[PDB]
Amino acid sequence: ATLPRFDLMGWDKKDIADPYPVYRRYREAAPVHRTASGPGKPDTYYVFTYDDVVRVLSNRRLGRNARVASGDTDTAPVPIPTEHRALRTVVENWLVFLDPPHHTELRSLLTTEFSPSIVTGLRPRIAELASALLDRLRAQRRPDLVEGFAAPLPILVISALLGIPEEDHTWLRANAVALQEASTTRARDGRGYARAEAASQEFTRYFRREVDRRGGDDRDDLLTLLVRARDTGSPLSVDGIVGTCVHLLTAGHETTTNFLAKAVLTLRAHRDVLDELRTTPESTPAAVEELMRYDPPVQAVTRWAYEDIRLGDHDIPRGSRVVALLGSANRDPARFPDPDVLDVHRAAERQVGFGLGIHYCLGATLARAEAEIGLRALLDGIPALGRGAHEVEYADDMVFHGPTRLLLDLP
Numbered sequence: 001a002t003l004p005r006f007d008l009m010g011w012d013k014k015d016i017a018d019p020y021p022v023y024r025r026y027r028e029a030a031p032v033h034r035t036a037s038g039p040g041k042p043d044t045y046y047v048f049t050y051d052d053v054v055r056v057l058s059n060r061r062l063g064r065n066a067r068v069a070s071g072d073t074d075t076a077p078v079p080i081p082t083e084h085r086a087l088r089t090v091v092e093n094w095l096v097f098l099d100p101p102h103h104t105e106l107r108s109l110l111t112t113e114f115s116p117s118i119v120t121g122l123r124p125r126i127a128e129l130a131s132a133l134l135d136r137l138r139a140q141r142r143p144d145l146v147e148g149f150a151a152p153l154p155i156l157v158i159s160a161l162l163g164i165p166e167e168d169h170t171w172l173r174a175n176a177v178a179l180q181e182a183s184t185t186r187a188r189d190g191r192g193y194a195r196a197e198a199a200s201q202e203f204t205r206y207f208r209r210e211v212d213r214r215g216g217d218d219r220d221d222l223l224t225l226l227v228r229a230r231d232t233g234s235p236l237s238v239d240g241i242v243g244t245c246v247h248l249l250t251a252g253h254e255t256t257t258n259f260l261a262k263a264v265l266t267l268r269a270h271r272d273v274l275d276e277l278r279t280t281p282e283s284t285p286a287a288v289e290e291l292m293r294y295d296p297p298v299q300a301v302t303r304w305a306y307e308d309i310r311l312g313d314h315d316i317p318r319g320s321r322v323v324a325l326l327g328s329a330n331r332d333p334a335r336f337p338d339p340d341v342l343d344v345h346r347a348a349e350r351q352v353g354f355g356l357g358i359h360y361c362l363g364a365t366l367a368r369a370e371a372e373i374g375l376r377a378l379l380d381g382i383p384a385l386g387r388g389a390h391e392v393e394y395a396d397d398m399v400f401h402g403p404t405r406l407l408l409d410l411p
């Protein structure tokens with residue numbers, strides 16, 4: 001061919017921070033790129049166009065279980081190495097890696113807790129949190145927008161939702177990042193799953209203690225809602241409740257964090273727009289839509305073929321692993337003219353940064369509230385947000401994509 005074998009492993013720092021040119025070349029050669037794996041194994045098909053990505057997350061034929069796909073069984077249900085138990089029992093229990101019917105029942109029991117009406121009555125407390133955070137972060141030496149803002153904001157929001165102390169916000173962040181070392185795009189090199197294993201163990205005990213405490217008080221809070229189901233005839237285990245808690249805690253912030261951080265890098269690289277938001281507050285909602293498609297926090301999601309399927313001009317055999325590049329789709333010229341230009345005026349409801357299909361983002365509404373509000377606080381809270389320079393460090397993560405830390409500078 002012309003361009004080489006494609007995958008998401010082992011990227012250099014500078015391409016992680018700006019992979020769009022990579023997605024562009026490959027996308028221009030072919031909409032799908034097959035990447036074999038060997039002797040009796042499944043190849044991976046990477047989808048780069050918007051239309052194909054939509055089909056992939058739409059198809060009732062692409063599931064989340066590799067072990068269901070292969071008909072094999074010496075195969076893990078979740079992409080977690082068998083030797084690691086705690087880790088593995090917590091990831092198997094994530095709604096995201098679930099297929100109907102189980103997934104349907106769990107999403108339904110959960111979905112009512114993130115309603116537009118609940119989110120609306122939360123906007124005030126989310127605004128108040130963000131402000132107080134910018135206060136502590138301001139009286140500080142070498143402020144880091146991530147650990148000092150983008151990370152604790154959504155953590156405080158989801159933690160109050162679950163029913164756990166805010167005082168643990170830093171402790172929750174640490175373990176979350178440690179656990180995150182298990183996603184498929186990271187190395188397994190030097191200290192692989194090791195840290196993710198210990199992170200899983202701490203969360204299991206931590207949450208186990210919580211659930212064991214339910215029937216003292218009972219407030220409205222996910223933990224109590226869950227344990228209530230189980231005690232009144234609902235079919236779910238502690239391993240189910242525990243994983244669901246970890247799943248929400250992580251799903252509840254790691255994406256919001258990466259979005260907030262990358263939203264700052266984007267605006268600083270587009271001062272005309274950032275200067276627009278500062279002067280015109282109502283533009284925020286529209287801007288959040290663009291910032292979202294321009295540089296989405298989730299660059300890749302995977303599905304598994306449960307029977308043969310034809311995507312693009314390739315036939316994807318039952319058992320294949322399919323990867324939908326959300327970041328590539330969002331910059332597909334076939335659907336977003338001038339994909340590299342930050343244009344807040346283009347029509348919304350097209351960007352797939354929140355996914356699509358039955359696994360669409362459970363807290364999309366909440367997420368969008370934290371983004372609009374959080375961005376606001378930044379725009380109004382840090383006048384020099386777009387001035388001077390900064391220093392950023394991206395993580396070795398192509399799934400949860402975004403800065404590990406983002407430093408700005410003081411007055």
Ligand code: HEM
Pocket residue numbers: 095096097098107114154158247248251252253255256259296297298301302326352353354355356358359360361362363364366367368371
């Ligand atoms: C701007 C921030 C956020 C972004 C960009 C985002 C993006 C996504 C994407 C792309 C998926 C699909 C994954 C797949 O198909 O494999 C997803 C799933 C999910 N997200 Fe969000 N998310 C965000 C915030 C949140 C928040 C704040 C919560 C907490 C309420 C949350 C909870 C979930 C859950 C539970 C799922 C799995 C749902 C299922 O499997 O049916 N997310 N998210």
Ligand SMILES: O=C(O)c1[nH]c(C(=O)O)c(-c2c[nH]c3c(Cl)cccc23)c1-c1c[nH]c2c(Cl)cccc12
Pocket residue numbers: 079091096179180181182183184185250251252255298300301302399400
């Ligand atoms: O590692 C992957 O390949 C992966 N793919 C997805 C996906 O959804 O397609 C995820 C994932 C888990 N939770 C998610 C949420 Cl809440 C949003 C978007 C993606 C994910 C993950 C993922 C994130 N963190 C993980 C950990 Cl810690 C273990 C195993 C998988 C993941």
